Amino acid sequence: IKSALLVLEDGTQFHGRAIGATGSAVGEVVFNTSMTGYQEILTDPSYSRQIVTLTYPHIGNVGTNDADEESSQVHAQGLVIRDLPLIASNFRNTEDLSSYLKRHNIVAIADIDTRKLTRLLREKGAQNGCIIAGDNPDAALALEKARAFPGLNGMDLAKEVTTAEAYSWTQGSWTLTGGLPEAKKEDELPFHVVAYDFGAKRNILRMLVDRGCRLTIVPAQTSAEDVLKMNPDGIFLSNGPGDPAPCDYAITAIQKFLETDIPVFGISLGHQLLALASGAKTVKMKFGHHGGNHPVKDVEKNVVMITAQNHGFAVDEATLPANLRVTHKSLFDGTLQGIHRTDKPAFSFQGHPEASPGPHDAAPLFDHFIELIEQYRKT
Amino acid sequence: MPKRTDIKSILILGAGPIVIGQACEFDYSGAQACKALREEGYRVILVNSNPATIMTDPEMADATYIEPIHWEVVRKIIEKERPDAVLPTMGGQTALNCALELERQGVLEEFGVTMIGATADAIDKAEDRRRFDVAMKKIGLETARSGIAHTMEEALAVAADVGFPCIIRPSFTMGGSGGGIAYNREEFEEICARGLDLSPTKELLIDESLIGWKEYEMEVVRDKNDNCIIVCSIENFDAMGIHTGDSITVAPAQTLTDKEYQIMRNASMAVLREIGVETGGSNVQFAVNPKNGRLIVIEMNPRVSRSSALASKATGFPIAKVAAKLAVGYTLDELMNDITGGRTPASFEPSIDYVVTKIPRFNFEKFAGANDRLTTQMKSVGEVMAIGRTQQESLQKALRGLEVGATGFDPKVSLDDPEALTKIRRELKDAGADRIWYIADAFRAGLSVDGVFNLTNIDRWFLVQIEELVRLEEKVAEVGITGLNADFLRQLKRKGFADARLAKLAGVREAEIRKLRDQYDLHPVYKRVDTCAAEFATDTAYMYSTYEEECEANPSTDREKIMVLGGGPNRIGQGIEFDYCCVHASLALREDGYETIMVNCNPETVSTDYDTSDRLYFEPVTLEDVLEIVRIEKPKGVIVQYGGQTPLKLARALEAAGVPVIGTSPDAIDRAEDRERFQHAVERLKLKQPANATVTAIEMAVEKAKEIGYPLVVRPAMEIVYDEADLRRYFQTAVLLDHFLDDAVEVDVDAICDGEMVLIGGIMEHIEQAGVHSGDSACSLPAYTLSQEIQDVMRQQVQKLAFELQVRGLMNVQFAVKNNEVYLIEVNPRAARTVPFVSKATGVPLAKVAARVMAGKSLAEQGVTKEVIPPYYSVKEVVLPFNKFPGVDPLLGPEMRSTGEVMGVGRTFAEAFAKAQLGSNSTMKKHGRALLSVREGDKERVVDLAAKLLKQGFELDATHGTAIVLGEAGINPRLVNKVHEGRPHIQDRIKNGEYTYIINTTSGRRAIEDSRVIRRSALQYKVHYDTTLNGGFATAMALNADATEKVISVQEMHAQIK
Ligand SMILES: Nc1ncnc2c1ncn2[C@@H]1O[C@H](COP(=O)(O)OP(=O)(O)O)[C@@H](O)[C@H]1O
Ligand SMILES: Nc1ncnc2c1ncn2[C@@H]1O[C@H](COP(=O)(O)OP(=O)(O)O)[C@@H](O)[C@H]1O
Ligand SMILES: NC(=O)CC[C@H](N)C(=O)O
């Protein structure tokens, strides 16, 4: 028998089985409703310091593989599931879930009532928690660790996951037939985009490459001055963990960009960051949006899109500057989902146009960003 | 946009009688469509020949037409009703075909009827397999290598091209009707010929084999604003080669990576976009090569289906309801999500935090001569569904709720049978209905997962899970009840193990396992369905049991509860009729102020529609499952008399476990069902009952037979023996012995007793004589030949029985009238399959009424005391599945084989009969040549019939014997040769289409087996034939009438009642 235990800040206990590394894990606890894409989810840097509970009972049905990694490592702090399948069954698999977790040194627990946990988080709101996996899991210790967690509000995590030094990205999207492409050649990409790495997902980069952008991935703290020096065709603000709020450096730099005519586009954290620099305020949601079936209306066109969501903070629509027009809203809760600067070539989306995992409905968000870029090169 | 305003009236095309492949799911959907459109203030007109439908309830729509679903009749309705639009997407294939004929016949144009939900062109683009393939090619999706065929010659050429095995699929058919897998030229020609004739467009698509590939389905929804969503994904347990409907399926998809799932997702949307479905749902099927994820599109159904119903039940998203509204202008974003309190929109993709399993239900045992192997043509007669927090749990629950005597993975072959592995191997390689059970036996026998995979092609992901169960079963067996500690037993329950199964392994009674659970305080919790993996709260109470931590039941303490037990999956003899009764109970008592609880797990039905009851428990209808619910609900009363056999068989145990069963007691029922207790009551009442004996040995019965008299009725399955020699005979191949009442009129009588009075609901006179099961006979209400005198006796006899037995609620009695003498066949102290028919002809909602009675409100109190006799004739006719199982002799007998029924309304019996006949899809014509071939006893009566046919302008043919008798009467038919006689014989003539009518009556195990060719040929060439003289006289009467002459609504019918 391999025990494991999960304890919430409020004292709630969940007893299960250890399916990953031996040890302890602490972080904010969340639930994601994605029936597929667990690997992608686990490898999302945005999940840094969060303990991920999956609502879909059977997690690991397809094992894992490299192409399904959205970053170089597993960023989730811990994984909480209802059931770990006996086997992985998919031509794409290269290593079973449990093995993968152990490899990445992830504390994970299975066999617990994830529905009870979900309903609790929904009703009471997010909560920090601690998973302990080992011979005899100390429930009082776990509760200690959880209660001591500083929490995500006001925590800059973007500076934690970002890249140390700048680098290039010219690799495109995966294909069933060919797999993951060989990185393009610089001369094979018309546009040059500078992307701020706030803990950026690979799919965003790949997709941008798919649309003809050669990329320069820059550390979160990179000054606007340094960027501007590279003569960007466009500036992109990646997704990532924590509160956008405390990221002074980014906001500052962005404001700078906003003085210029360089097109700016941001996704999730980048949306937030954009809104902040534009003088809007960001709030911490009760429980957030974590899943792949979230309806978002494009208010302009009056069309709905099924989207992939992964965020705990939002832009207050009621503090939006007049220079910030609303472009999309959640059909689930009415929360702000998109904005466009009425006076600048800058826009952002709260959701994940790049999906991975999730529906491709929002990818056209990218196209607009290309538009701007094309136009900008016109001038 | 919001609702359309250019449309005020909508005509909905219903599905007609239930058949294999086109079942209950269409009453559920048509009921949801009607309710949705009526909710939105539209004028609802619908046509459906099946009377046992909730959708035809008078109060459900404005103008309800229980008329034959034939374009000419519909034309009448249209003419008369002048609908602004027609919704053809809620009645299976019948609806699709009919809307397209109406269109082709220029009827839609004639009456300016607008086609909503889907356009004629989109329906064709999907139904026409040739067009479908093109469309795919256009959008760059892949389909298997195929060829279109319009003739055999054409067909043979494609075959030559794709090689064997090859799959044959007709255009304009579903449920695999007219199709199959050809493994050779012989099989091939057989199938194609059948398929070519069946196809409304005379077209076949022949494809190369993808047998063994994974099979998937997606349920999609699209609106006029181009918003589109995936409501549900389905992964088939049984691979490609076995029809989705004859397969075990699960939601959601299990083995697709996110990347593959998105491709599939994208493709499904593109399919609908290309076919042109912009305001509704569609089902899209695929095949996936497990080795490389290669995606192939199979087909698409531009309507609601069995899978959309499974899907609605699985996610809690009412697809049909939504789709109805979309048909009239609404967009997804404008509608609200029912289950989440309408706090969220219909424009979203559901997420489920559990596993849904569906297992098909078969009835091979009823089709002795049938090929019982599963193929591309559906042979299932029903289905069960189960929800569990895990697959193991989900699967096991489905198994024990299948109503086949299974408690889970019960063995089929013994461990010490040296021949075991051979049988097991066969059962895995070539799947029959028992395969699921053979799979565990394989693991029990030493077969590996890989071993089993190579034979079945069922994903290892599922296999490894079954094996685990087996191994656990092995431990239980080993440790015995002693090793069943609280920890282990909990693990077991979490895996979905039934007490009954554990009981067997441990070698104890089931109550012992259950005792143990009560001791450990080991009970399940109930989770709720919410479409959103608990991301939002719900106000609906749609639950399932599971062994977890938190319980969401939260029973009320507030009201008086009434529980209603359903019948699980439908089977022959246990259909929709019972469900209908179950629904009515719920609706009635709910309206009266009770808190209604529905317990059932049939995904196809209206009973498992969350709107039908206050609280729905989608559970196995077993003693274990039901006691757990009672345990926490603590109902006031439980009805076990309305879901058929399933709930009836539980009554005693329930009562004894302390369940407050209401209505007719378990014991009373027992009194009636038990041959002995009954013979005793009948005796006591001084009533007439056929001579009977209870033989133990052969020679014993020969003697006793002598006593009783031939012909004899031998009840263990049921046969009729004629002579001593005939008795042995049976005995070989082969116990109640009863004298068979020859040339007797059968009658059904449905009634209600409140212990104070007896209300006669309806006396039905069967067309077919006693000996042809009531369930397979046409019948008339009111009687069309019986005397008022004789009817009164029965009525009196009913009343006697009613009180004697202590009936409280419904009852049905079966009589036989021989020589102006009334004989009692049996008593059914419960709701009978005829209840819905009677309620519709008479206008009295018998089920409702009896429900109220069971609940305490006397007939007098309800004001339902006088027997109704309608001012019209109502005729019920059935539909048999013989076309699905060709190797079977399509002949009537004492065993019920029909799957559905229709109703015919007329000012005259003949007019009623003609409507019912046409409705049953008969191919009868009002001219041509008839073929007479009857048996001895009929020889006398056949002359008049021949004369009748002659009067009608028909030319006659006959076989020797028959020719003799007619000749001696002054009627010279054209002699025709039996098959052993020479040429040409009946067979040849039938095949060349020489006949438009056939009357062929037989009597004797030999005479039957001899004449088998006449019936098989008649069926195959589409010639209406009657296997009873009585049947033939009705058909004859009906020739005088015009089914298309006049149409009447149920509302109007009802209004005619005094
Ligand atoms: N190329 C093929 N190879 C093997 N099995 C096939 C092939 N195409 C279809 N099938 C099987 O035939 C069944 C019936 O096919 P389908 O196109 O759905 O017709 P229907 O409209 O009658 O349901 C499918 O569910 C599937 O299991
Ligand atoms: N003694 C009998 N004489 C004539 N017909 C009979 C007799 N017993 C039964 N039948 C025929 O058998 C059918 C079924 O018999 P029944 O006892 O009612 O069995 P079940 O349980 O299936 O309803 C009847 O509907 C009837 O046509
Ligand atoms: N997904 C992201 O890129 C960031 C979301 C942001 N960190 C939040 O939790 O709201």
Ligand SMILES: NC(=O)CC[C@H](N)C(=O)O
């Ligand atoms: N099961 C219930 O009664 C749940 C009530 C509450 N609305 C919820 O969804 O949590």
Ligand SMILES: CC[N+](CC)(CC)CC
């Ligand atoms: C499936 C129902 N039918 C095909 C549309 C055959 C019984 C109607 C005739």
Ligand SMILES: NCCC[C@H](N)C(=O)O
């Ligand atoms: N009501 C049963 C079907 C009747 C059929 N035509 C027969 O006479 O066999």
Ligand SMILES: [Cl-]
């Ligand atoms: Cl738990």
Ligand SMILES: [Cl-]
């Ligand atoms: Cl069909």
Ligand SMILES: [Cl-]
């Ligand atoms: Cl392939």
Ligand SMILES: [Cl-]
């Ligand atoms: Cl057959």
Ligand SMILES: [K+]
């Ligand atoms: K547990």
Ligand SMILES: [K+]
């Ligand atoms: K019109």
Ligand SMILES: [K+]
């Ligand atoms: K089709």
Ligand SMILES: [K+]
């Ligand atoms: K093809």
Ligand SMILES: [K+]
């Ligand atoms: K299948």
Ligand SMILES: [K+]
């Ligand atoms: K299907």
Ligand SMILES: [K+]
């Ligand atoms: K009969």
Ligand SMILES: [K+]
């Ligand atoms: K019976």
Ligand SMILES: [Mn+2]
């Ligand atoms: Mn089809």
